[PDB]
Structure formats: C-alpha cells, structure tokens
Write a protein that binds this ligand. Structure first.
Ligand SMILES: [Cl-]
Ligand SMILES: [Cl-]
Length: 129
C-alpha cells in the first residue's frame, strides 16, 4: 500500500506515534517519506547483508526475523514480512521500541540527514487530524 501523506499521519496518530518519546507527528511522517515514499512494501538490502522493511525501513540486523541475516536479533519478535503489511500496526509497535533504544530518531539515518532540524510540521500541515 502507498499511503497518502495525510492518510499516513492519521494512521500513525491512531497508533500512538504523535509525540511518542517527544517526537511530533511530522517527524514520523518525514521519516517515512524518505525511508519508503510511504510504500508499505519497500525493501532495501544493506551492505552488511541485513534488509530494511516497510514504511519505516526497519532493519533485520536487530529488529525482525527474515531468516537470512547472520548473527542477527529479532527484538520486535516479528517476521520482517509483517512490516510490509497494508496495516501499519507492526511497523508502529516496532518503531516505538527502536526510538526508545537510547538514540531517539537518530536510529533512522535518513531522519538525521533529511528531517532533523527542518520544518517537519510541513509534513502534517493541512491534514485533518
Ligand atoms: Cl509536527
Ligand atoms: Cl530523544
């Protein structure tokens, strides 16, 4: 599923992401924009052989099981394929764990490089919600 901007903002809000660990809704929408272009099916292979999955490009090195990342963990206790669903519940629940791990949203390199220190509220501006 490719979400609309305001559609994704609403789904994230419903699942308790606005202001989670202090990160406003626009931070999460901005992160998703640059990680997946709002496509729940986005997958990308990393140099290390791990793979990033879903709307927030959650990595198989620590967070989900894909069966093909040696020496990995599955800290969200989920198959990586659950992160590609049209229903974002699994991605949101696992993102809550990630952003609580100590470095906040800097866990997402694209958030640090493309969202952090910008007008992230632009990403939810005009949205009813
Ligand atoms: Cl915001
Ligand atoms: Cl923080």
């Amino acid at each position: 599923k490719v979400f609309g901007r305001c559609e994704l903002a609403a789904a994230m809000k419903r699942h308790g992401l606005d202001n989670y660990r202090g990160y406003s809704l626009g931070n999460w929408v901005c992160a998703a924009k640059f990680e997946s272009n709002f496509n729940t099916q986005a997958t990308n292979r990393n140099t290390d052989g791990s793979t990033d999955y879903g709307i927030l490009q959650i990595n198989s090195r620590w967070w989900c099981n894909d069966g093909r990342t040696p020496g990995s963990r599955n800290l969200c206790n989920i198959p990586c394929s659950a992160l590609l669903s049209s229903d974002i519940t699994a991605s949101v629940n696992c993102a809550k764990k990630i952003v609580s791990d100590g470095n906040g949203m800097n866990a997402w390199v694209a958030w640090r490089n493309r969202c952090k220190g910008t007008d992230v509220q632009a990403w939810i501006r005009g949205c009813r919600l």
